[PDB]
Ligand binder design. Structure first.
Ligand SMILES: *C(=O)/C=C\c1ccc(O)cc1
Length: 125
């Protein structure tokens, strides 16, 4: 395991050093998106929650293709405003339900340390 706690204040600095391999060691789901919502990284833990195969979703658009249930003001709406503002740090509960058993999760979205990338972190509640 990589020891990092969900919701940690300095999480973006810690994750900056991790490769896809290390990301797979986290205790929670982690997705990295570009400013358009394309998936740059997707870890094993997120795959465990959602059923998606991590290698098969990289390169696809999270909001349009992979996770249309997040296409709403409550999720996508918050992401887009964060991208526009260049600042994002929000935590909320949500239910993932597209092609899967409805699963309640806690979501934390945060701007990454690099210019135009964004993290989505996910854990069961
Ligand atoms: C709602 O959340 C719908 C789908 C979904 C699929 C994959 C991932 O990672 C999150 C959400």
């Amino acid at each position: 395991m990589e020891h990092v706690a969900f919701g940690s204040e300095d999480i973006e600095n810690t994750l900056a050093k991790m490769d896809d391999g290390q990301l797979d060691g986290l205790a929670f789901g982690a997705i990295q998106l570009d400013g358009d919502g394309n998936i740059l990284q997707y870890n094993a833990a997120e795959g465990d929650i959602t059923g998606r195969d991590p290698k098969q979703v990289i390169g696809k658009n999270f909001f349009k293709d992979v996770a249309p249930c997040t296409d709403s003001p409550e999720f996508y709406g918050k992401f887009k405003e964060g991208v526009a503002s260049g600042n994002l740090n929000t935590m909320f509960e949500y239910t993932f339900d597209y092609q899967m058993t409805p699963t309640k999760v806690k979501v934390h979205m945060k701007k990454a340390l690099s210019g135009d990338s964004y993290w989505v972190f996910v854990k069961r509640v």
